[PDB]
Ligand binder design. Sequence first.
Ligand SMILES: *[C@@H]1O[C@H](CO)[C@@H](O[C@@H]2O[C@H](CO)[C@@H](O)[C@H](O)[C@H]2NC(C)=O)[C@H](O)[C@H]1NC(C)=O
Ligand SMILES: *[C@@H]1O[C@H](CO)[C@@H](O[C@@H]2O[C@H](CO)[C@@H](O)[C@H](O)[C@H]2NC(C)=O)[C@H](O)[C@H]1NC(C)=O
Ligand SMILES: *[C@@H]1O[C@H](CO)[C@@H](O[C@@H]2O[C@H](CO)[C@@H](O)[C@H](O)[C@H]2NC(C)=O)[C@H](O)[C@H]1NC(C)=O
Ligand SMILES: *[C@@H]1O[C@H](CO)[C@@H](O[C@@H]2O[C@H](CO)[C@@H](O)[C@H](O)[C@H]2NC(C)=O)[C@H](O)[C@H]1NC(C)=O
Ligand SMILES: *[C@@H]1O[C@H](CO)[C@@H](O[C@@H]2O[C@H](CO)[C@@H](O)[C@H](O)[C@H]2NC(C)=O)[C@H](O)[C@H]1NC(C)=O
Ligand SMILES: *[C@@H]1O[C@H](CO)[C@@H](O[C@@H]2O[C@H](CO)[C@@H](O)[C@H](O)[C@H]2NC(C)=O)[C@H](O)[C@H]1NC(C)=O
Ligand SMILES: *[C@@H]1O[C@H](CO)[C@@H](O[C@@H]2O[C@H](CO)[C@@H](O)[C@H](O)[C@H]2NC(C)=O)[C@H](O)[C@H]1NC(C)=O
Ligand SMILES: *[C@@H]1O[C@H](CO)[C@@H](O[C@@H]2O[C@H](CO)[C@@H](O)[C@H](O)[C@H]2NC(C)=O)[C@H](O)[C@H]1NC(C)=O
Ligand SMILES: *[C@@H]1O[C@H](CO)[C@@H](O[C@@H]2O[C@H](CO)[C@@H](O)[C@H](O)[C@H]2NC(C)=O)[C@H](O)[C@H]1NC(C)=O
Ligand SMILES: *[C@@H]1O[C@H](CO)[C@@H](O[C@@H]2O[C@H](CO)[C@@H](O)[C@H](O)[C@H]2NC(C)=O)[C@H](O)[C@H]1NC(C)=O
Ligand SMILES: *[C@@H]1O[C@H](CO)[C@@H](O)[C@H](O)[C@H]1NC(C)=O
Ligand SMILES: *[C@@H]1O[C@H](CO)[C@@H](O)[C@H](O)[C@H]1NC(C)=O
Ligand SMILES: *[C@@H]1O[C@H](CO)[C@@H](O)[C@H](O)[C@H]1NC(C)=O
Ligand SMILES: *[C@@H]1O[C@H](CO)[C@@H](O)[C@H](O)[C@H]1NC(C)=O
Ligand SMILES: *[C@@H]1O[C@H](CO)[C@@H](O)[C@H](O)[C@H]1NC(C)=O
Lengths: 50, 197, 436, 179, 49
Amino acid sequence: GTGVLTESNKKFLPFQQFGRDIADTTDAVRDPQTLEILDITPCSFGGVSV
Amino acid sequence: ALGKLQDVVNHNAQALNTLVKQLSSKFGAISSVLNDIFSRLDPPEAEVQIDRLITGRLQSLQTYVTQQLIRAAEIRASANLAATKMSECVLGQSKRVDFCGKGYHLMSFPQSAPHGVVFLHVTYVPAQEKNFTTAPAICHDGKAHFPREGVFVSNGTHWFVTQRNFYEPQIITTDNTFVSGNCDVVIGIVNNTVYDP
Amino acid sequence: TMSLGAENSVAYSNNSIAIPTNFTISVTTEILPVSMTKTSVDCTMYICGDSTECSNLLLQYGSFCTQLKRALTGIAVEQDKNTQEVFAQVKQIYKTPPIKYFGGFNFSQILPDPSKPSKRSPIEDLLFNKVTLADIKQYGDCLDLICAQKFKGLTVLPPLLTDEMIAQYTSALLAGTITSGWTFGAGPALQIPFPMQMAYRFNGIGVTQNVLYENQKLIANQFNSAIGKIQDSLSSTPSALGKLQDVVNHNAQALNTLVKQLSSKFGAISSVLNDIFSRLDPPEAEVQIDRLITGRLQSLQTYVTQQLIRAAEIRASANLAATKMSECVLGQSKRVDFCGKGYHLMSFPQSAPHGVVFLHVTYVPAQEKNFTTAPAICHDGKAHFPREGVFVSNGTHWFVTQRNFYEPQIITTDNTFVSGNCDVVIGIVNNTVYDP
Amino acid sequence: GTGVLTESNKKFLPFQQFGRDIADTTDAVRDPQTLEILDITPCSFGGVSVITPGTNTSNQVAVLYQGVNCTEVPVAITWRVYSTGSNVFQTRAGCLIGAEYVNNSYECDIPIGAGICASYQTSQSIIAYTMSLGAENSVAYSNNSIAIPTNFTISVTTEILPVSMTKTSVDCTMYICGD
Amino acid sequence: CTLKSFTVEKGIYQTSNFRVQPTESIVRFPNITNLCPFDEVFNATRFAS
Ligand SMILES: *[C@@H]1O[C@H](CO)[C@@H](O[C@@H]2O[C@H](CO)[C@@H](O)[C@H](O)[C@H]2NC(C)=O)[C@H](O)[C@H]1NC(C)=O
Ligand SMILES: *[C@@H]1O[C@H](CO)[C@@H](O[C@@H]2O[C@H](CO)[C@@H](O)[C@H](O)[C@H]2NC(C)=O)[C@H](O)[C@H]1NC(C)=O
Ligand SMILES: *[C@@H]1O[C@H](CO)[C@@H](O[C@@H]2O[C@H](CO)[C@@H](O)[C@H](O)[C@H]2NC(C)=O)[C@H](O)[C@H]1NC(C)=O
Ligand SMILES: *[C@@H]1O[C@H](CO)[C@@H](O[C@@H]2O[C@H](CO)[C@@H](O)[C@H](O)[C@H]2NC(C)=O)[C@H](O)[C@H]1NC(C)=O
Ligand SMILES: *[C@@H]1O[C@H](CO)[C@@H](O[C@@H]2O[C@H](CO)[C@@H](O)[C@H](O)[C@H]2NC(C)=O)[C@H](O)[C@H]1NC(C)=O
Ligand SMILES: *[C@@H]1O[C@H](CO)[C@@H](O[C@@H]2O[C@H](CO)[C@@H](O)[C@H](O)[C@H]2NC(C)=O)[C@H](O)[C@H]1NC(C)=O
Ligand SMILES: *[C@@H]1O[C@H](CO)[C@@H](O[C@@H]2O[C@H](CO)[C@@H](O)[C@H](O)[C@H]2NC(C)=O)[C@H](O)[C@H]1NC(C)=O
Ligand SMILES: *[C@@H]1O[C@H](CO)[C@@H](O[C@@H]2O[C@H](CO)[C@@H](O)[C@H](O)[C@H]2NC(C)=O)[C@H](O)[C@H]1NC(C)=O
Ligand SMILES: *[C@@H]1O[C@H](CO)[C@@H](O[C@@H]2O[C@H](CO)[C@@H](O)[C@H](O)[C@H]2NC(C)=O)[C@H](O)[C@H]1NC(C)=O
Ligand SMILES: *[C@@H]1O[C@H](CO)[C@@H](O[C@@H]2O[C@H](CO)[C@@H](O)[C@H](O)[C@H]2NC(C)=O)[C@H](O)[C@H]1NC(C)=O
Ligand SMILES: *[C@@H]1O[C@H](CO)[C@@H](O)[C@H](O)[C@H]1NC(C)=O
Ligand SMILES: *[C@@H]1O[C@H](CO)[C@@H](O)[C@H](O)[C@H]1NC(C)=O
Ligand SMILES: *[C@@H]1O[C@H](CO)[C@@H](O)[C@H](O)[C@H]1NC(C)=O
Ligand SMILES: *[C@@H]1O[C@H](CO)[C@@H](O)[C@H](O)[C@H]1NC(C)=O
Ligand SMILES: *[C@@H]1O[C@H](CO)[C@@H](O)[C@H](O)[C@H]1NC(C)=O
């Protein structure tokens, strides 16, 4: 996937690895090398009108 | 009573979440994640799986637009009615029955609301009715007399003329009643004296 | 090449005026659809019946069933609302007087008939039988066109208000109009003798209340005869009831179309689902089955989409019918052609299967006579203008009469208000204005 | 096929073995062992609807089985289907379980259908009642009787009409092919 | 479950469909009697070499 990555403030249980939104798309994940919960959000988008 | 305005918000909201849930729908594919299909499938066979997902999303998009368009017409019909009520009721007195409030419409006052307009209809409601004895016309001097703009009324002894909506008894006068024809032709005629000022 | 209509030439001049000398009371019928059959469809067993495998793909395919059930439910709820707004205008149920004399006016045809089992008017019973060709809680055969729908799941939900309850509403509306006229609609019902009420309505159309009173018997005979002609006109097979019949035909055609789409392969090897699951292997079955579900789903979506569009049309008709209920039946309406043709006197509502039939009593002028007219009359140097009539010349003496019926009156100071001078106005004719 | 099987009154020609009705489903089949014709109707099916006063107002509920005879549905047949002791009312809409039919007529609260409505009333329980059209008023028509109001009241009534819906836009590409 | 909410408001809601399940299975004999003569071929007095 493609997005911007920041540290996730969501408390994340030890057995839990993946977080999903209402649409069930993955929004949070733990880094493989060191378990670090990171929120994934889409890169900035916006409609343009002339 | 603002539920009608509330329903409009609920329908637009609920349909919007519906499109979101349709994203998770498989549509006969291997996964609902497009990137997963690309990684898990080589380009030739991937086209078959992606196409099934593409129409599934496309059909959901087509349905939502169709639902919105039908919903838009319903709101436009209400808006055209509301615009008519704006002109017919607020801007002037309307004789159309029950269009502007219940009963006789004195005036209407508009009040703004989120995604709607609230109408305050000031109406005249008659009350405290009292029964009376009435006659179609009064025979006084051999010529039948009809009430010009009122109704002939006696409480039991003396006949009077009053406006239809409100009880105000006036003595029978020549100015009060226009005279035409003779007494015999009209059925139900009642003898009384028509005073001349 | 079709004719637009008859060609008639009306002679226009400065001086010529036509004043009617007689009137014809005409009763016209207006038919408006009010509701459609409330249909609910079991999505799963429309898609596939006793197909345990198909339940897996249908669940996997999505929750499309929820919206279709919700969309159909919204239509069904709205349908019961439409009949409520049109019929339940009056909160108080009104009972017809035991005395049926109304000054010679005969209302037996439109009044409910106690002898008939259903508390319906003779016109209403005739209306039901004309439409009853299109219409089973026992389901004895089915545990027959109705079963062809429930065998597939297309089910008809009974209306919340039954016909008897609707008939009670119509009779209550009938009782209010005869006994109280317009008063019952706006506020508490006030009794008023019927000849006075019709005389009041005559003033609404611009005719003085006296004209009705001398011609009461003639009006009563005209009105009673006019009601009778409606019965045989409705008894004629070519009728406007097709509009009501179109609604049921539209519902039937849609229901049959869904049945055909079941037999429609949508490109499948076999229309029958059992053949798909049996002959082919589970891998090959899925490809053939998936194409079947997509085709079945599209037919359901088109039916719901088409039903929503048709439901909107009924809603527009229902709103128009409700407006006609309040504006015409409850009171006299000055909107031209809104209720019947010609000047509207009053309207009678009669319930119909899935609709309402409006009987509009209208005033139609007749037997017009030419006359010569002047805008104003000069008597003593000041122009006189008719207060509420028109200056009509008999050819020897001038007269003033009401503009919808010929009743010549001698010009008096009361008849004509004075204003201005004589020279300013064009076409003013010299005459004598009698002073009482 | 799957359904309840009964004898068939309708005759069959010698060559034809099974018969499909207007529904195009086989509604009558002749038994291969014994040439007698048998009528086949599917096992009884129907949709269920739940009448609830609301989660705030207790958890007592009543359930109506649409378009099904009361004797048709057994008390055994996921839910317990309440019990035969629970009041059973047969309506044109279907069979209703768990509500007391009463002869008193009240204004509708929950529309069951066919003139039947139910509400939570007290000892609070769900009761099904026949529609009350309204109060019955008889007005004395007469040759010479008229009524004229001696007073008036000014009333203010409110009408609420939707005017506009929320403007919405869709970025098609990210919905269909996201990222 | 159908409303997908813990709270439910006043009203009537369609929730599911109740169906009677089949009690047992039935398969039907065509009364076929076209039996093979292999038995008398098996019950043959002599067999070929
Ligand atoms: C019906 O007509 C009038 C209206 O009330 C009544 O006449 C009045 O009666 C009072 C009572 O003595 C007198 O003081 C007034 O001078 C009367 N007015 C006129 C114009 O005559 C009459 O009494 C009423 N009938 C009954 C039975 O009360
Ligand atoms: C009143 O009289 C005038 C004058 O004769 C009529 O005008 C003509 O009427 C005849 C027959 O009615 C028509 O054939 C002519 O075409 C009319 N003249 C013109 C110039 O068109 C008038 O019609 C009479 N009024 C009525 C109601 O018949
Ligand atoms: C109506 O009367 C007028 C006479 O005042 C005539 O109509 C026209 O009037 C203007 C102004 O007087 C003249 O210039 C025209 O020549 C008149 N036209 C005709 C055709 O006469 C006429 O007498 C009347 N209009 C009719 C009969 O249509
Ligand atoms: C106006 O009313 C009708 C036409 O609308 C006519 O009255 C007829 O009079 C004859 C003469 O006795 C009767 O035989 C008919 O029955 C009457 N008609 C009806 C419908 O009853 C006539 O043109 C006019 N009559 C009057 C009194 O003005
Ligand atoms: C109102 O009209 C109806 C219809 O003509 C009258 O009922 C008819 O009465 C006659 C004689 O009793 C019968 O021969 C007809 O069969 C009846 N017709 C119907 C449709 O019932 C009724 O008498 C009239 N009533 C008044 C008060 O005029
Ligand atoms: C105009 O109307 C008058 C009144 O109806 C008609 O003249 C009347 O004629 C009779 C005898 O023919 C007299 O007894 C009346 O006194 C006359 N009335 C008046 C007011 O003079 C006259 O015939 C009508 N004009 C036309 C052309 O028909
Ligand atoms: C109506 O009568 C008056 C008065 O008789 C007419 O006014 C004109 O006044 C002038 C000047 O005072 C005089 O020539 C006559 O008195 C009148 N002339 C004519 C030709 O009558 C007025 O014209 C008359 N109107 C009509 C339509 O005849
Ligand atoms: C005016 O006239 C009489 C006076 O009592 C009323 O007639 C009776 O009124 C009572 C109650 O108002 C009704 O229950 C009766 O049915 C009436 N009699 C008949 C024969 O129907 C009449 O109702 C009074 N009018 C009003 C508006 O109160
Ligand atoms: C109005 O009073 C009259 C009594 O004069 C009744 O109406 C009809 O009157 C005629 C002639 O007297 C009788 O032959 C009829 O039998 C009367 N009709 C009925 C139905 O009996 C009646 O009492 C009054 N009408 C009302 C109150 O509507
Ligand atoms: C008409 O209007 C109202 C009744 O709707 C009456 O006003 C009441 O009058 C009494 C005594 O005068 C007071 O105690 C109340 O407080 C008043 N109510 C209001 C809302 O002001 C009024 O008196 C009636 N008058 C007539 C003649 O009927
Ligand atoms: C690799 O990841 C594992 C745990 O995820 C752990 O051994 C360590 O964090 C990483 N190894 C090195 C050498 O960084
Ligand atoms: C009114 O009085 C006159 C004069 O006697 C009479 O001719 C007429 O019949 C009376 N009318 C009534 C309705 O009593
Ligand atoms: C239900 O079935 C019984 C007999 O099986 C019958 O008497 C009754 O009328 C049926 N109910 C309805 C509503 O048809
Ligand atoms: C809904 O629940 C709240 C909280 O228990 C309560 O205050 C309210 O009265 C309830 N509403 C109804 C209509 O019972
Ligand atoms: C109510 O009506 C039913 C039939 O409609 C009847 O069986 C019963 O006796 C009546 N009374 C009561 C109190 O239920």
